[PDB]
Amino acid sequence: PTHDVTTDRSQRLTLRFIPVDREDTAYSYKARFTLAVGDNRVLDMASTYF
Amino acid sequence: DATDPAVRAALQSQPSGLNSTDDWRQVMDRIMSLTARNPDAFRQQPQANRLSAILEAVVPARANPTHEKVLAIVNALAENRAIRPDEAGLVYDALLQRVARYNSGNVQTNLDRLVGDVREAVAQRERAQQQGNLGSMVALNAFLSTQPANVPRGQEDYTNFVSALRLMVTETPQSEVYQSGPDYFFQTSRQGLQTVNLSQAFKNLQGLWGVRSLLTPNSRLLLLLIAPFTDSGSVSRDTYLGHLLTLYREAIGQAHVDEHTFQEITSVSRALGQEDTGSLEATLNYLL
């Protein structure tokens, strides 16, 4: 199918997310992210990883 | 004429002035000065403008209708939603290339038959939109083949209900029925709310036609939409479905006069001087 399936606008495939705030214990660390999904985008969380 | 694919093709290909080929009679009335308004407007032109119009009149120039015949076809494909408006230049060069490879006396006659065929097909679709019946009658009668034609009790209420059911889809051109999987539905307008479920409503009303807290709210939504198309004698008075169809006709008529009462009370509450926040809440609590 031509239209109504894949966009013709400037849209990325993979995004890179810098940690917003990282904190460390002696046995663990914590990484807070902003998982920003823009307009008209769906994100299956199976495609997300660290 | 604004939705005519050959009038629109004349506004995109033909000149906006009076040439001596498309408008030979209208320019010979001006060359020979037999025009009603300003007859002597042709004598007051220079020889470069005056002799070049006489030469194009006594021996006119031939022209190609092919770019005008194809553009009437493209502007009807773009109007009956057959192509996208972005594809209107893509399929125009695609059709001009085909009638250039295969150009003949047959094809130019066949394009002349097809620009009269798409004038009809644009008008036939726009008549079918304002009638709004052909897509709905074939899919409501397809629904009623599934439903049984003989209920045990209250057949007199059942055969007038399904006849009033044909009256909504006929006397509302925007309303439609369709199928989505097992069940059929009924939207009261294109891209609007109040979608009833016909296969769930008629498996709920079956067993309630002669009964004289138990209704699914889409069946009551169906009994609200069918109410202005149902007479007092179409269903019974004592029957619980017939008792509600009269009750929903009074609810529509009360909501039609509480609409006009709302426009009166809020009009005379602004001029008299009140809070505009509380004028709009005390009115509804008086009307609801």
Partner: protein
């Protein structure tokens, strides 16, 4: 969920004067995941009694229109200021003061003159030259745009859905807007 849905409450935009887009009333929901059939049935009768009020409030108050949330409201359907005409009592007689001054009298300060019984009164139109159209205010967003109870949601063919619930959707483009 289909029989007794949650109403789509409209988001206003005070700048354009149109509705932004409707999302369901998720923030006024009532939690009966710890109730039984003696009380789940009583709350579902309140979810449905509310939806009967919103269909009754929309039949009273909402203007009947084809496109839900239009982009340019007509001037006949927008509440417009129609004040009383301004009555101006003009202070001075113009040609009776150019004859006192030409005669040598110096006028200073200020019927209102002792030398003129004439009094001119001017009545002017207070309202605008053209009636305003295009965007409704806050009070007409309250009257219209009663929260949409959308029974059996998204059951139709595509294109017959409420796309004007979506805050990205242009009606005259039939497409969702992007970042450019």
């Amino acid at each position: 969920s289909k029989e007794i849905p949650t109403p789509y409450m409209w988001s206003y935009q005070p700048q354009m004067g149109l509705a932004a887009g409707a999302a369901q009333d998720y923030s006024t929901r009532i939690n009966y995941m710890s109730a039984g059939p003696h009380m789940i049935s009583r709350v579902n009768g309140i979810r449905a009694h509310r939806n009967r009020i919103l269909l009754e409030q929309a039949a009273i108050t909402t203007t009947p229109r084809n496109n839900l949330n239009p982009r340019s409201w007509p001037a006949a359907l927008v509440y417009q200021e129609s004040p009383a005409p301004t009555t101006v009592v003009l202070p001075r007689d113009a040609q009776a003061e150019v004859q006192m001054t030409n005669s040598g009298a110096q006028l200073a300060g200020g019927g209102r003159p002792s030398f003129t019984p004439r009094q001119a009164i001017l009545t002017l139109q207070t309202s605008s030259s053209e009636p305003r159209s295009g965007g409704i205010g806050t009070l007409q967003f309250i009257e219209e745009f009663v929260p949409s109870v959308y029974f059996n949601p998204f059951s139709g063919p595509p294109g017959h859905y409420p796309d004007q619930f979506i805050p990205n959707f242009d009606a005259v483009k039939d497409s969702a807007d992007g970042y450019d």
